[PDB]
Amino acid sequence: LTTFSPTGKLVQIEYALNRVSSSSPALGIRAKNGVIIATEKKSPNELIEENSIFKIQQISEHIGIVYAGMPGDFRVLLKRARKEAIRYSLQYGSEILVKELVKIIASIVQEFTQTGGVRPFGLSLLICGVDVYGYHLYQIDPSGCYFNWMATCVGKDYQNNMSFLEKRYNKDIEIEDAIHTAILTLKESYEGVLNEKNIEIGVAYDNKPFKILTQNEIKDYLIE
Amino acid sequence: QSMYDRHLTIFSPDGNLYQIEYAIKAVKNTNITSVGVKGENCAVIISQKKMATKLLDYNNITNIYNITDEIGCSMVGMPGDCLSMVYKARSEASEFLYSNGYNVNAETLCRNICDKIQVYTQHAYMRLHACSGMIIGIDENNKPELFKFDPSGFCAGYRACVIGNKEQESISVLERLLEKRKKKIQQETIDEDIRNTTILAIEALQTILAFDLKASEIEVAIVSTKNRNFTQISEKEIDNYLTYIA
Amino acid sequence: TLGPVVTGTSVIAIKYKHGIMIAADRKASYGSYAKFQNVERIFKINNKTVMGFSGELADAQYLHELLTRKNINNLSEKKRKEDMYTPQHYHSYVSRVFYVRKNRIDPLFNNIIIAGINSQKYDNNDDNVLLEEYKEIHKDDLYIGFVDMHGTNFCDDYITTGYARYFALTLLRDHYKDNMTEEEARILINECLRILYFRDATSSNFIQIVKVTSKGVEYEEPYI
Amino acid sequence: AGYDLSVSTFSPDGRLYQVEYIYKSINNNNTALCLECKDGIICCCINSNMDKNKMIKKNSYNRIYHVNNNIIITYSGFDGDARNIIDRARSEANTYYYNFHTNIPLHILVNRISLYIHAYTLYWHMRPFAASIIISSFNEKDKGDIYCIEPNGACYKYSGIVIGKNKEMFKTEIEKKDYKDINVRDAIEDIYKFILTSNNLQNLVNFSWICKESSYEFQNIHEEILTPALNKA
Amino acid sequence: WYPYIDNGGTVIGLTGKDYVILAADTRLSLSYSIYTRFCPKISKLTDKCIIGSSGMQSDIKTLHSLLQKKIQLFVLEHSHYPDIHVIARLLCVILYSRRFFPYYAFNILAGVDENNKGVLYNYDSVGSYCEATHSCVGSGSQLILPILDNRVEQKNQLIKNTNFNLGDDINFVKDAITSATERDIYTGDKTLIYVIDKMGINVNTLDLKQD
Amino acid sequence: SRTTTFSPEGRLYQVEYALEAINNASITIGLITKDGVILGADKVFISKLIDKANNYEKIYKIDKHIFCGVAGLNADANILINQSRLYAQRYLYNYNEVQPVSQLVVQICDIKQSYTQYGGLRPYGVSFLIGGYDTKDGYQLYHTDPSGNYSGWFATAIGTNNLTASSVLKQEWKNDMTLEEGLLLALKTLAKSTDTEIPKSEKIELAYLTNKDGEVYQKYLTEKEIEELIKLYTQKYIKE
Amino acid sequence: TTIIGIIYDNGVMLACDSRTSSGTFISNKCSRKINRINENLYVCRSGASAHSQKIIEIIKHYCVSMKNENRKKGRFHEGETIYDETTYDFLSCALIFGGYDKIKKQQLYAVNLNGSIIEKHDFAVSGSGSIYIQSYLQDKYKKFMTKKECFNLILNCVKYAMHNDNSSGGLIRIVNITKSFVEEFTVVNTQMN
Amino acid sequence: EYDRGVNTFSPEGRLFQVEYALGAIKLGSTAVGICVNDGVILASERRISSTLIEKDSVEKLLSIDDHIGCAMSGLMADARTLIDYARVECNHYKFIYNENINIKSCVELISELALDFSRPFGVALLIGGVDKNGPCLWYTEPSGTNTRFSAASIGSAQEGAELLLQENYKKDMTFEQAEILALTVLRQVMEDKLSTSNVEICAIKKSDQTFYKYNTDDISRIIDVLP
Amino acid sequence: MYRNLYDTDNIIYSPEGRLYQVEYASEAIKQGTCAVAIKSKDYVVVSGLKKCISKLSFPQEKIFKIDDYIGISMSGITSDAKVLTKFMQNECLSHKFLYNENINIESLVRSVADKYQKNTQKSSKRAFGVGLMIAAYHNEPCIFETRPNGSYFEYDALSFGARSHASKTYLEKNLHLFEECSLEELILHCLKALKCSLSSESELTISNTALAVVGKNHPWQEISSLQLEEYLSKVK
């Protein structure tokens, strides 16, 4: 029942976009030999074990996802994302393409806007992964649209967070060199200067299966 | 004024679900607390045994409900919403056996509960379930597991956590109580976790509730290895552990 | 179900002045042999009416439970002693259960005999579900009904189901008298079931005689 | 700002309004009472609605119901809405009797009735129930137990409980005498003395006791034991 | 499992000016052994229209009670007792309501509607109602129908016995049913000669050959 | 209120706001030539971090001979394309032949019309220039609205600044237009609609059908339109 | 595939062979004809082994979903078996239910093809090889016995039921049931001579 | 002011959505029906102000069956839906029972369809027939009250025709007696002249038990008697 | 904030604790005509007053018939009362078809009162605003009645909304009906209730007061249009 407005814009969608504009910052940057993703994990205390609460989940052996909104919604969209990675894998024996997968999740998010008595999704996705047509890094909007980004951020204060990427990014960057330009876009962007194994980073890892980098592995890059 | 918090599936201009936000305040208004803490190869839940705000039989009122013989859990908040949540968990954990053979895992149980909770959020079918709880239980990996879930979707999981009306005055105490065993002595594991974790658990509850903590108004449960039963510790052992503070 | 795998023997219901006399053995044959020899067939359904079997004993539980349940529901609304379900009601209800099964193909092979006292002039306005002198009835307040597996239903003064229809009923159609004494009725069945011991291939001893009088539902167990 | 309209709306304070009004609805209806004894569980039900009809039969308006021979149920509130819960109670016993061939125990029936009342609270279209239910029984080996079901679940085991228009009055009268070890034949005369305190000499109080070693099954009021009421002491 | 059996029996119908005669037998015979000698096969509906049948009792007690339900539902919704023409069309759709599983019970509808007009409706087990001045239905269908055929329709050159009073005709049906018990097996003994005159019905009984 | 209710003026509310919601969207140009229909687009640039070389979300593909240029809500556009692709294929599965566009817009405007009539749901804030080739009546170019009142055309400029860009096609368009001359004709109206004099080429996208008895339906690369952009410099088919 | 259930003076015992022949061939040698349900009751089924594993699965699901409905340490015994009968509203399979109870001391009673009305039984026995020892059991079985008496009785019972049967098992299984729930799966391997 | 819900009550014990339609039936064309001892005679106007109409496609006296005729008022678009429903159930009754339906059993089913709890049907009828027990005339309302009338009137001018029938109805009036009476009440409340086109009377005689529409030729011999 | 929020919905409850939407239905039965029934030892007579809306109209029926020994008399709106009559007719007739005994009276009203309950919790369907009056005889003649909320009261005499207070007071001091075994004194006692509780200066009983009796050897015999005006409508 999220109807229109006299100005010609959905008001519930604009309200939903404010929720992703005030959550933890998610950041993905593509490269020429893989795609990387990062998320500022706001650790509230030492009681929450890091191996339970995560911001980087998998869809298949080559698809990575990132969350940027309502934590309670970080699982329902994941269940239908993995289900679509299975329904395509049952009929078609090969792997699910990212463009074929993102167009289905965008259709699922869309149906939660036109249906009566429902609420739009309070999150922004970041689907990334190795494909047979190169690499990809898409971003799903609560409105239902999707963009074929190259390097983007969706969390809190992204108007100036993207400014680091508009001036410190080249078309031909390796995945190992893109890690430090991503950490700089997190530590040197805003508060959270005590970045000591409090950042989750997933990579495509040059056509190998999706690898979730461990805390001590990121520590090698956290020294700079 | 008539703000935007009437329905449950309607976002606010700033982007906050106020029907969920008010539901969390329902748990903080029941003035019933509970502490859960996982140590080495064990985990315990400490209840409070208080009426959700004469002749009431105190053995019947409780805040501990076993979902299965391996996975136990606690419940707080409104008494009506917490009872139905156990039935929506017992009928789910037992359904896992009929649909998958193995016993349900502790981490899978909480995520399957949150899936049904999230469905009632996006749809205006029913009212939110004003409750919370600490799902306890060991897994096949011979490791203890603890998980807390809010009225919204959450599968946080903590090595020591407090649920109830005093979550804003206990993290500063549970961190010290956990530090009183991790970076301290930490000699070995002589399978005496009960004398090591539960003693360092009841002490945490006494630091939260300023009362004398009568043994006939508190009941705990252990799911440690060699036991595996979510057994409610008897009254005589509770009163015996209360004298260990001296 | 299909095929009488666990059959039963035949019962004999005869009415007299003090009450209803019923009798049945305890043999539950598995077709060609006596598997169970200590089962009960005379089932208590009320404080004034009972019912017997024949046919498949397995297709009797789907009728016993569907009948004892109705007694507790009626007992929970006993606002007067006349609100008890008369035997006319139970016999007509059982016939409706068999008629709706006859519309389908599964008939639940049984030849249920329903007997009881169809009156309320003897004070029993207190029920003892979980556990002096007799009276004389006018022969019209004693209801004994028969129900075939095809749904045939009626009521008479002496009914005999199953295989004893060709043996018991013959000796009983001419030897039956009106207002028989208690010793006359039991000596009539004792000399009758003796004929059903040398001719019926599926019959035995342990005649569980049950009498329904104006004071209760008794139980006895001779051995001939 | 008017947030107590539907049942699915949560108040900003944290309370659940539109369900707390039901307690103010059962506080204006007639009362019911029950208590533990060393010989059984005597019940009670006062129908303080004498000033308007005066034409009903003496023993007609009965508010004592039983699912079977050993579990009694009473009402406190809207008498029409309580009929629907008894229908769900007897059907719960009959469904349990089909699947398990035994009488339904008390600790499994109360948990199934409370779920039925609570289930109508969650809906945005169905109105919640308006009747508090008292469920009790008396085992042969174990002693009795009285479960009280109010709106919005909350099944609680009691030992004596009164609900109605004088719940803050009769509660003080039960704690005086230890009813846990007295009898049933003397408590019935003590119960009739309480009603006279708080309003006429009328036989509008119909009640039965589940056990007096009378096969430990739900009996009736047994008028002959009720007529020698100590109307003065 | 065959769900169609025949309990055996018969019903005889006759007419005239202001009278119809319906007679039956109460032998509720099972497969091959007679079970009860008393089971009425005719049941009154209104004060001027009865119904006879002869199939299995499973499709008779139901069909007679179902017809009593749909006829009592009609009288308290119109405040007028139905005639036979309306009750004849009523059984036409009840029997056709179960075309895939027909009621194994043929029927007889007798009664008076106008001042005299003795009508008699008879039909098969599927629902093709047809008016007739005389009919027989049941186990003794093929044995009584030609006897009655020599009284109403004629084949003689001299049309004998033109008059037909209720007194002599009543003894004629008793003569036909007695002629059925001797030659047919399923014909019972206790008979119920129902006579519907202008004022009402009778319950004139007669006990036949117990064989 | 809801879309089910009318208004005292006789118009509607939800379908009227959707007609205005597409006015705040990027422009698209339609054009029928003597060789094949061509389309235009305007990639709205949120930032310079998009791919800008492999994809574009303003012109899609319906079938091997039917293609549309969408304009409006990019989110709601993907549903109708996922709905028109089925009708363009269910017709092949039921009649073993290609579907005429005249029988496609009717099949797709009814799905919009069905939303502005019942269900109590919001309408589709989308409107697109759908064109194709058929054996019955050659090249065609239709145009749908959020209400469903489709209509045939020769040139349309929906999106933002429609009235200005449509006036360009009132004079500069000719009945006989070749493929290369039509592209230059549609290139100027696509550029002057955004109040600019030359496209940055890291902008607007074009498509063209030109059935060579097989319906090639080639799209355009960022390098192929450079030659078209250069030809606009020399021969300027100006605003006027 | 014989199954013998003999009652004690205090508890009960169960016995079964392990053959499960599939068309004059042993495809699942040394299988489990007996099955566990809880700490106080076991279920040993025979007959058609096709739908047998499904009924054991549904019973295990309906037992766990029922024991947690009361409290943590209380199941019931008669209630669970009548639920197994209601699941026959076909799947031809004979079952044996036996175990200790909180109300009565012990309880053992069969479930035939379609009707479980064999309560208060004493020497329940079913299966294919059950036809060969129905008389031998009726003679050597007294009213009250001891633990070693019933263990030595059912040992020859399964032995005699295997000495003259094509569906003779390999290693036999014997399960005990008591108040303390000893439940030791005493497996015997010796055969007749 | 309580007008949102359709099934809301009133503190004075009254309905609201039904009462709105009570005034909607006072805007249609007037009609009048008289139940005499020999049959039932109906009458109505014909607002065919625009001469371009066919004059036969618009009718105010349709037929439920061959034995039951009725009038219409209020919403003409909704009146046809109830008449089409009455034409089904009355005909469905003839297929089950061989006799014609009784008006008491027909008006009770035409009223239960106005109990959709959509919206209540804003239409009042004047169902009349000679089914059995002589002729009967019934008048239904959107509220469901079925009152058997001897002579009533429905329409925009039903108030004036009400008191006229009270001062003119006699029990011993034949067909030709009431036929002039069915027009004198129409001559009073009429913004035109009682020509041979504005009036559309029809009657159901007790003899043939069927209805017969009085055509243009037969009504000319009745409108010229000058009551 | 009060007086207009908790008024139009069948779901919301007042802060005092009263379902005000259902409470309007209980008052909605008071706008109807009067009715009265007398329970004797072996007979039950029901006196119902019809309402002639116009001189040309006919008095609409008030007393109905359900079975041979069961007859009701509505008092309220004819819309919902007719629906409950069909529900009570299909229910009692099914009992004589599914079984052969007659339907128990209290077991019948329990189904009718349940029909009110089902139309009280749902938000769509409203409550039946109609005061039923079930008068029957099975073994002891009992008189039951319902309200919009589920209720039963084995009454001995009643009244229904027109001049109920003037009629209730007459029955409060007339409790000798139990011993007035003569049917003639019963029907005169029942008609005297309406005569002493009619409107001011109105026609007493000019053949427009429906009367029905039921008893031991009496089915639901509607009092004919001749037996009442000969001596019953002529004594006063």
mmCIF file with all atom_site columns, N, CA, C and O in Angstrom, chain G residues 162-186:
data_model
loop_
_atom_site.group_PDB
_atom_site.id
_atom_site.type_symbol
_atom_site.label_atom_id
_atom_site.label_alt_id
_atom_site.label_comp_id
_atom_site.label_asym_id
_atom_site.label_entity_id
_atom_site.label_seq_id
_atom_site.pdbx_PDB_ins_code
_atom_site.Cartn_x
_atom_site.Cartn_y
_atom_site.Cartn_z
_atom_site.occupancy
_atom_site.B_iso_or_equiv
_atom_site.pdbx_formal_charge
_atom_site.auth_seq_id
_atom_site.auth_comp_id
_atom_site.auth_asym_id
_atom_site.auth_atom_id
_atom_site.pdbx_PDB_model_num
ATOM 1   N N  . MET G 1 162 ? 14.845 -69.878 14.511 1.00 0.00 ? 162 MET G N  1
ATOM 2   C CA . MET G 1 162 ? 15.826 -69.703 13.459 1.00 0.00 ? 162 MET G CA 1
ATOM 3   C C  . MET G 1 162 ? 16.346 -71.028 12.939 1.00 0.00 ? 162 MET G C  1
ATOM 4   O O  . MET G 1 162 ? 16.861 -71.082 11.820 1.00 0.00 ? 162 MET G O  1
ATOM 5   N N  . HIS G 1 163 ? 16.228 -72.091 13.728 1.00 0.00 ? 163 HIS G N  1
ATOM 6   C CA . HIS G 1 163 ? 16.719 -73.385 13.283 1.00 0.00 ? 163 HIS G CA 1
ATOM 7   C C  . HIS G 1 163 ? 15.875 -73.947 12.151 1.00 0.00 ? 163 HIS G C  1
ATOM 8   O O  . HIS G 1 163 ? 16.390 -74.686 11.307 1.00 0.00 ? 163 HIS G O  1
ATOM 9   N N  . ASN G 1 164 ? 14.595 -73.595 12.092 1.00 0.00 ? 164 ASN G N  1
ATOM 10  C CA . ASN G 1 164 ? 13.725 -74.105 11.042 1.00 0.00 ? 164 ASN G CA 1
ATOM 11  C C  . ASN G 1 164 ? 13.046 -72.970 10.295 1.00 0.00 ? 164 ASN G C  1
ATOM 12  O O  . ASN G 1 164 ? 11.826 -72.948 10.135 1.00 0.00 ? 164 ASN G O  1
ATOM 13  N N  . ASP G 1 165 ? 13.822 -71.998 9.832  1.00 0.00 ? 165 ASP G N  1
ATOM 14  C CA . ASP G 1 165 ? 13.230 -70.896 9.092  1.00 0.00 ? 165 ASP G CA 1
ATOM 15  C C  . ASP G 1 165 ? 14.230 -70.352 8.086  1.00 0.00 ? 165 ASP G C  1
ATOM 16  O O  . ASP G 1 165 ? 15.415 -70.210 8.393  1.00 0.00 ? 165 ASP G O  1
ATOM 17  N N  . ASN G 1 166 ? 13.736 -70.045 6.882  1.00 0.00 ? 166 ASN G N  1
ATOM 18  C CA . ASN G 1 166 ? 14.596 -69.503 5.837  1.00 0.00 ? 166 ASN G CA 1
ATOM 19  C C  . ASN G 1 166 ? 15.004 -68.073 6.138  1.00 0.00 ? 166 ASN G C  1
ATOM 20  O O  . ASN G 1 166 ? 16.035 -67.606 5.643  1.00 0.00 ? 166 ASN G O  1
ATOM 21  N N  . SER G 1 167 ? 14.217 -67.366 6.947  1.00 0.00 ? 167 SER G N  1
ATOM 22  C CA . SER G 1 167 ? 14.518 -65.993 7.327  1.00 0.00 ? 167 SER G CA 1
ATOM 23  C C  . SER G 1 167 ? 15.227 -65.929 8.667  1.00 0.00 ? 167 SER G C  1
ATOM 24  O O  . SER G 1 167 ? 14.999 -65.004 9.454  1.00 0.00 ? 167 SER G O  1
ATOM 25  N N  . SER G 1 168 ? 16.067 -66.918 8.942  1.00 0.00 ? 168 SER G N  1
ATOM 26  C CA . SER G 1 168 ? 16.813 -66.988 10.185 1.00 0.00 ? 168 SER G CA 1
ATOM 27  C C  . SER G 1 168 ? 17.866 -65.903 10.231 1.00 0.00 ? 168 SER G C  1
ATOM 28  O O  . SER G 1 168 ? 18.587 -65.694 9.257  1.00 0.00 ? 168 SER G O  1
ATOM 29  N N  . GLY G 1 169 ? 17.972 -65.230 11.366 1.00 0.00 ? 169 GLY G N  1
ATOM 30  C CA . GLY G 1 169 ? 18.936 -64.167 11.508 1.00 0.00 ? 169 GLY G CA 1
ATOM 31  C C  . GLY G 1 169 ? 20.340 -64.650 11.779 1.00 0.00 ? 169 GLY G C  1
ATOM 32  O O  . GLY G 1 169 ? 20.623 -65.838 11.920 1.00 0.00 ? 169 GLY G O  1
ATOM 33  N N  . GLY G 1 170 ? 21.241 -63.682 11.849 1.00 0.00 ? 170 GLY G N  1
ATOM 34  C CA . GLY G 1 170 ? 22.630 -63.951 12.126 1.00 0.00 ? 170 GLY G CA 1
ATOM 35  C C  . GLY G 1 170 ? 22.810 -63.727 13.605 1.00 0.00 ? 170 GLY G C  1
ATOM 36  O O  . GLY G 1 170 ? 22.436 -64.580 14.412 1.00 0.00 ? 170 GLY G O  1
ATOM 37  N N  . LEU G 1 171 ? 23.366 -62.586 13.983 1.00 0.00 ? 171 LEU G N  1
ATOM 38  C CA . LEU G 1 171 ? 23.549 -62.292 15.393 1.00 0.00 ? 171 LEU G CA 1
ATOM 39  C C  . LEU G 1 171 ? 22.222 -61.772 15.928 1.00 0.00 ? 171 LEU G C  1
ATOM 40  O O  . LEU G 1 171 ? 21.651 -60.833 15.366 1.00 0.00 ? 171 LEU G O  1
ATOM 41  N N  . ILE G 1 172 ? 21.720 -62.386 16.988 1.00 0.00 ? 172 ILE G N  1
ATOM 42  C CA . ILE G 1 172 ? 20.444 -61.984 17.554 1.00 0.00 ? 172 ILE G CA 1
ATOM 43  C C  . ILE G 1 172 ? 20.661 -60.870 18.568 1.00 0.00 ? 172 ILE G C  1
ATOM 44  O O  . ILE G 1 172 ? 21.747 -60.703 19.128 1.00 0.00 ? 172 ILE G O  1
ATOM 45  N N  . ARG G 1 173 ? 19.615 -60.084 18.795 1.00 0.00 ? 173 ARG G N  1
ATOM 46  C CA . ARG G 1 173 ? 19.649 -58.972 19.731 1.00 0.00 ? 173 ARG G CA 1
ATOM 47  C C  . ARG G 1 173 ? 18.605 -59.193 20.807 1.00 0.00 ? 173 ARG G C  1
ATOM 48  O O  . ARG G 1 173 ? 17.491 -59.635 20.522 1.00 0.00 ? 173 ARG G O  1
ATOM 49  N N  . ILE G 1 174 ? 18.968 -58.883 22.043 1.00 0.00 ? 174 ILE G N  1
ATOM 50  C CA . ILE G 1 174 ? 18.078 -59.020 23.184 1.00 0.00 ? 174 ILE G CA 1
ATOM 51  C C  . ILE G 1 174 ? 18.163 -57.723 23.962 1.00 0.00 ? 174 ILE G C  1
ATOM 52  O O  . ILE G 1 174 ? 19.249 -57.331 24.398 1.00 0.00 ? 174 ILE G O  1
ATOM 53  N N  . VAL G 1 175 ? 17.029 -57.054 24.124 1.00 0.00 ? 175 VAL G N  1
ATOM 54  C CA . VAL G 1 175 ? 16.959 -55.774 24.810 1.00 0.00 ? 175 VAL G CA 1
ATOM 55  C C  . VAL G 1 175 ? 16.120 -55.924 26.065 1.00 0.00 ? 175 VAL G C  1
ATOM 56  O O  . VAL G 1 175 ? 14.993 -56.424 26.007 1.00 0.00 ? 175 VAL G O  1
ATOM 57  N N  . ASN G 1 176 ? 16.669 -55.493 27.191 1.00 0.00 ? 176 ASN G N  1
ATOM 58  C CA . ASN G 1 176 ? 15.996 -55.544 28.475 1.00 0.00 ? 176 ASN G CA 1
ATOM 59  C C  . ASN G 1 176 ? 15.399 -54.181 28.787 1.00 0.00 ? 176 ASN G C  1
ATOM 60  O O  . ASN G 1 176 ? 15.790 -53.170 28.212 1.00 0.00 ? 176 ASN G O  1
ATOM 61  N N  . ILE G 1 177 ? 14.435 -54.165 29.706 1.00 0.00 ? 177 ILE G N  1
ATOM 62  C CA . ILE G 1 177 ? 13.758 -52.946 30.139 1.00 0.00 ? 177 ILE G CA 1
ATOM 63  C C  . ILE G 1 177 ? 13.428 -53.116 31.614 1.00 0.00 ? 177 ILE G C  1
ATOM 64  O O  . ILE G 1 177 ? 12.806 -54.109 32.000 1.00 0.00 ? 177 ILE G O  1
ATOM 65  N N  . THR G 1 178 ? 13.834 -52.167 32.455 1.00 0.00 ? 178 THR G N  1
ATOM 66  C CA . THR G 1 178 ? 13.555 -52.253 33.886 1.00 0.00 ? 178 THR G CA 1
ATOM 67  C C  . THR G 1 178 ? 13.130 -50.904 34.436 1.00 0.00 ? 178 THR G C  1
ATOM 68  O O  . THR G 1 178 ? 12.820 -49.989 33.671 1.00 0.00 ? 178 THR G O  1
ATOM 69  N N  . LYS G 1 179 ? 13.109 -50.771 35.764 1.00 0.00 ? 179 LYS G N  1
ATOM 70  C CA . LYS G 1 179 ? 12.761 -49.487 36.362 1.00 0.00 ? 179 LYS G CA 1
ATOM 71  C C  . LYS G 1 179 ? 13.918 -48.517 36.204 1.00 0.00 ? 179 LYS G C  1
ATOM 72  O O  . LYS G 1 179 ? 13.732 -47.362 35.808 1.00 0.00 ? 179 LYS G O  1
ATOM 73  N N  . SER G 1 180 ? 15.132 -48.986 36.479 1.00 0.00 ? 180 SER G N  1
ATOM 74  C CA . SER G 1 180 ? 16.327 -48.175 36.332 1.00 0.00 ? 180 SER G CA 1
ATOM 75  C C  . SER G 1 180 ? 16.762 -48.051 34.887 1.00 0.00 ? 180 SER G C  1
ATOM 76  O O  . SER G 1 180 ? 17.732 -47.334 34.619 1.00 0.00 ? 180 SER G O  1
ATOM 77  N N  . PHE G 1 181 ? 16.072 -48.742 33.977 1.00 0.00 ? 181 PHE G N  1
ATOM 78  C CA . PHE G 1 181 ? 16.334 -48.767 32.539 1.00 0.00 ? 181 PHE G CA 1
ATOM 79  C C  . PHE G 1 181 ? 17.756 -49.250 32.256 1.00 0.00 ? 181 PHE G C  1
ATOM 80  O O  . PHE G 1 181 ? 18.612 -48.496 31.793 1.00 0.00 ? 181 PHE G O  1
ATOM 81  N N  . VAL G 1 182 ? 17.977 -50.526 32.581 1.00 0.00 ? 182 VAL G N  1
ATOM 82  C CA . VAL G 1 182 ? 19.277 -51.145 32.336 1.00 0.00 ? 182 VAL G CA 1
ATOM 83  C C  . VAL G 1 182 ? 19.567 -51.129 30.843 1.00 0.00 ? 182 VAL G C  1
ATOM 84  O O  . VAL G 1 182 ? 20.612 -50.635 30.402 1.00 0.00 ? 182 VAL G O  1
ATOM 85  N N  . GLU G 1 183 ? 18.612 -51.626 30.054 1.00 0.00 ? 183 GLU G N  1
ATOM 86  C CA . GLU G 1 183 ? 18.613 -51.613 28.589 1.00 0.00 ? 183 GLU G CA 1
ATOM 87  C C  . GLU G 1 183 ? 19.887 -52.112 27.921 1.00 0.00 ? 183 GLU G C  1
ATOM 88  O O  . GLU G 1 183 ? 20.271 -51.610 26.865 1.00 0.00 ? 183 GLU G O  1
ATOM 89  N N  . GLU G 1 184 ? 20.567 -53.078 28.510 1.00 0.00 ? 184 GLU G N  1
ATOM 90  C CA . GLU G 1 184 ? 21.795 -53.511 27.862 1.00 0.00 ? 184 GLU G CA 1
ATOM 91  C C  . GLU G 1 184 ? 21.449 -54.400 26.676 1.00 0.00 ? 184 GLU G C  1
ATOM 92  O O  . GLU G 1 184 ? 20.774 -55.421 26.828 1.00 0.00 ? 184 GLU G O  1
ATOM 93  N N  . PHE G 1 185 ? 21.916 -53.996 25.496 1.00 0.00 ? 185 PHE G N  1
ATOM 94  C CA . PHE G 1 185 ? 21.683 -54.719 24.253 1.00 0.00 ? 185 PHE G CA 1
ATOM 95  C C  . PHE G 1 185 ? 22.504 -55.997 24.240 1.00 0.00 ? 185 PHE G C  1
ATOM 96  O O  . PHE G 1 185 ? 23.503 -56.080 23.520 1.00 0.00 ? 185 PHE G O  1
ATOM 97  N N  . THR G 1 186 ? 22.102 -56.988 25.030 1.00 0.00 ? 186 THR G N  1
ATOM 98  C CA . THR G 1 186 ? 22.811 -58.259 25.113 1.00 0.00 ? 186 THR G CA 1
ATOM 99  C C  . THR G 1 186 ? 22.686 -58.972 23.776 1.00 0.00 ? 186 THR G C  1
ATOM 100 O O  . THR G 1 186 ? 21.614 -59.454 23.414 1.00 0.00 ? 186 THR G O  1
#
